[PDB]
Protein: villin
Organism: Gallus gallus
Amino acid sequence: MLSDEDFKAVFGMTRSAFANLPLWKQQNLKKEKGLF
């Protein structure tokens, strides 16, 4: 699970807020980042 710090250097905002974009935008920004 992307711990706060890790998330930081991954998406930009927070994973909680990260789940506010469109679901297709989610899986995308994900495999695009936060997947590692």
